[PDB]
């Protein structure tokens, strides 16, 4: 189905030395029987659990097709390149755990459209740029870790970010704001 | 002197024209008098005249060498798997003695030369895996002796031409995987009397299948798959006397499977899956000694005819996603080397046929979302061929056969949402290839066998909604490839041990609605990939381990237990509001807690 | 995509 095709596309662009994705048979009608993939009672993907898999490579925009996805766990890997903007199309997403990877480039502004997100852990990456203000519009956000990145600019202090401590934004290139020592220009 | 040739000079000119990085034309020595012993060069005639040149897979790059046409007696040219580039020259017609031209898997681009039809001797044209574009030239209707036309995996953007039906000599029409303008199957294609193969997969075909196609007595393969064809399967197709394979899958075809397909004695393979076909599967088709019958994802109804069991050649039956009713043929698998059975998401009822694995070849048994009743046939205990068993969402009852647990090549065993009773046998230890075990929502009883720990490659154990009991086997903690353990809704008792540390690859632990007692091991935090923990509905006692703070958990429930003390401060947040309810001893900075 | 002519082996 569409969901299986999207996950297969991810498999093709990922480097998988331990063959953790060997169960990912595209000829199966649904990806639900695949290991590391969990489906709901309507057989739609709700969880992808691929942390500490020694996975290398790049993510694909086609992850955005998984509308009912709630947990995306791709942490403790060497996945490189940008965080796809289409991850913003994952409306039902509750967890985005891309931490302990080599992701580079900006944090997409699209991630603000994740209305139900409770966890955003993008820590221990090489992400650059400013923290999108859209993330303040995520009312459900309870855990944020953008630490150990190369991010720069103003740190938002409003909405969800109102509650966030300095530990979330630690060890970044040039973060200015109230949470940081350095006040903004 | 009239029989003297310059063939060596001509081939040396060909060598100069093309780039040869990997030096595949080093044998081509200018000093050599005759080119006949050169690599890829065959002179089959009395004189020193080249008759065949095969330069396949030589990493040769450059435009087509039109000088080669000066080889007067060249009848066979293959440049397969090379980097020939640019347009195919119209001067190729000068190769007037060519019977075979293979320019497949090259980088040739542009419109097809019309002058190809001006080669009278041509029997075989393969231009597959090139970037040819535009309309198929009208000259192609005037081919005199061509038997094979392959234009597969090119970039042709035209309508499928009706004049191609005018090549009487044609035995194979291969136009697959081309970006054609949406086109109807020319009815004039019915006039290709000698045609053995019609391969038009992914040709953007629209409209009805023409009744004319039934006149192709000599046809062996009809592939009209992965197109947008509409209408009924023509009843005239019973006239394909010599047909072996019919592929009509993933079209928009409607209507009933014609009973006239029973007249096709040589037919072994039918796939009309992912269509809107309605009505019953005809008995007359099922009477044919078929090898593969795939009619999956249609709107077909009624009983599967018993005649299908008679076939001695049947290895594949995929009829899933239909409204088919009644029982599976009693003799199914008895007379045939059955390998793949998929009757899933149908309304089938009754006992499973007794001897499905009679010939010892059954790999995949998929019957999910049917109303099948009774016990697992004991024969299946000796079906070591099986790799995938999906018997889930049926009305099955009774103990699982002892051997069925220990089948060596099984990767997935799904018995979920049945009324299966009894225990997991010690024979499970022999299930070397078992990765996923799903036994959820059954009436299974007893302790989990110690031999379940012998299955190191087990990745999932899901046994929710069962009557399983006793302490967890110590061996269970030896499973370090285990990613999901869901034992919720059982009667499991006893304590968790420090051995849970070995579950280094466990993402989910659900031990909820059990009778587990004791303290949550401090080693819970050593589980690197644990993101989901439910120990709710148990009698777990003591202080919540400080180790739990080390875990990044997207789901936590320690509710309705005997846990006591103060929450580790990390867990005192509003997100963990419903995680610790029903633990009386437990007090933290949460508005319901104490 | 370019599979040789024959059935589609989709399975559950
Ligand atoms: C035009 O299209 C037709 C149909 O699409 C196509 O015809 C067929 O040709 C193929 C390719 O040669 C045939 O394929 C095989 O079947 C034969 C049995 O007759 C097998 O022996 C082959 O088998 C295997 O083992 C080999 C090693 O020993 C392997 O290298 C190989 O990969 C196989 O595993 C092979 O499977 C096919 O049988 C016919 N089918 C019909 C219906 O005629 C034709 O080739 C196309 N021509 C052009 C020029 O495009
Ligand atoms: C553990 O269970 C797994 C669950 O299916 C088994 O998996 C599959 O294993 C089979 C056989 O190893 C494999 O088959 C095919 O795909 C291959 C990959 O391209 C392909 O090369 C194969 O082709 C050929 O081999 C077959 C073997 O019968 C011959 O008949 C053919 O003529 C040809 O030479 C073949 O198409 C599956 O791909 C694979 N699927 C998955 C999803 O992993 C394991 O085999 C099994 N192991 C044990 C020891 O029990
Ligand atoms: C948290 O604080 C930020 C910073 O002030 C708030 O900001 C911003 O949101 C408004 C949207 O209401 C953006 O502006 C709008 O301006 C455009 C013209 O560009 C106008 O056409 C719209 O009608 C609208 O008035 C503004 O650019 C944006 N600021 C930044 C830096 O991106 C944010 O709304 C606060 N959080 C909330 C409300 O949750
Ligand atoms: C294409 O073929 C049709 C069908 O023709 C006949 O049946 C074939 C199986 C074979 O036996 C042919 O030799 C037969 O002629 C052709 O059709 C008919 O045309 C004839 C005159 O040639 C006419 O008297 C008949 O009544 C027609 N019958 C039918 C059923 O159509 C048609 O002419 C051929 N077209 C081309 C472009 O060659
Ligand atoms: C159908 O094939 C025949 C030959 O098999 C083609 O016949 C020719 O007709 C043209 C004029 O129409 C003559 O100039 C040629 O000399 C004929 N050639 C032969 C070999 O007889 C006929 O043109 C073809 N029709 C189509 C549409 O391709
Ligand atoms: C079955 O056919 C459909 C189309 O009839 C295939 O689907 C589409 O897939 C293409 C190429 O991947 C997409 O660009 C289109 O957007 C899709 N179209 C529609 C209408 O959905 C589908 O992949 C085929 N499936 C199988 C299993 O063969
Ligand atoms: C699979 O089995 C479960 C358990 O027997 C079915 O579940 C429940 O559904 C009924 C009626 O809808 C409820 O009254 C129960 O409270 C549910 N119990 C549990 C444990 O979930 C489920 O509907 C079955 N699914 C199918 C497709 O048959
Ligand atoms: C066809 O391929 C050949 C070789 O890849 C191309 O050849 C030439 O142009 C190159 C770029 O300037 C040079 O580096 C080569 O030495 C030269 N080789 C020759 C002429 O044999 C050629 O231009 C290609 N043509 C097209 C249309 O793709
Ligand atoms: C991640 O991959 C890149 C290779 O492009 C490499 O430079 C980097 O050191 C890798 N880190 C690992 C394997 O720890
Ligand atoms: C994160 O990165 C810092 C350096 O940026 C390093 O000291 C720390 O060990 C890393 N944390 C994890 C969880 O790997
Ligand atoms: C824990 O389980 C109880 C019932 O078993 C439920 O009411 C509560 O919402 C659950 N809490 C969480 C965090 O899932
Ligand atoms: O050479 C045997 C070969 O014949 C042809 C087809 O029926 C194939 O399936 C088979 O393998
Ligand atoms: Na799964
Ligand atoms: Na002709
Ligand atoms: Na289609």
Numbering used by the authors:
A (entry chain BBB): 27 to 211
B (entry chain AAA): 13 to 606
C (entry chain CCC): 109 to 120
The authors write:
Here we demonstrate that HSL1 binds IDA/IDL peptides with high, and CLE peptides with lower affinity, respectively. Crystal structures with IDA/IDLs or with CLE9 reveal that HSL1-SERK1 complex recognizes the entire IDA/IDL signaling peptide, while only parts of CLE9 are bound to the receptor. Our work reveals that HSL1 is a receptor for IDA/IDL signaling peptides.
The vastly different binding affinities between IDA/IDLs vs. CLE9 to HSL1 prompted us to determine co-crystal structures of four HSL1-IDA/IDL-SERK1 ternary complexes with: IDA, IDL1, IDL2, and IDL3 (at 2.31 Å, 2.38 Å, 2.20 Å, and 2.70 Å, respectively) and the HSL1-CLE9-SERK1 complex at 2.87 Å. Structural superposition of the HSL1-IDA-SERK1 and HSL1-CLE9-SERK1 complexes revealed that both IDA and CLE9 bind to the HSL1 peptide-binding surface, however, with the CLE9 N-terminus (residues 109-112) adopting a radically different orientation compared to IDA and IDLs. The lack of receptor-peptide interaction in this region is supported by the poorly defined electron density and the high atomic displacement parameters (B-factors) that indicate high flexibility of the CLE9 N-terminus. CLE9 and IDA/IDL peptides share sequence similarities in their core regions such as the Ser in position five (Ser113 in CLE9) and the Hyp in position 7 (Hyp115 in CLE9), enabling CLE9 to bind HSL1–SERK1 with lower affinity. However, Ser65IDA, which makes direct contacts with Asp283 and Tyr308 in HSL1, is an Asn residue in CLE9 that is unable to interact with the receptor-binding surface. In contrast, structural analysis of the HSL1-CLE9-SERK1 complex reveals that CLE9 is only partially recognized by HSL1, rationalizing the reduced binding affinities when compared to IDA/IDLs (20-fold reduction).
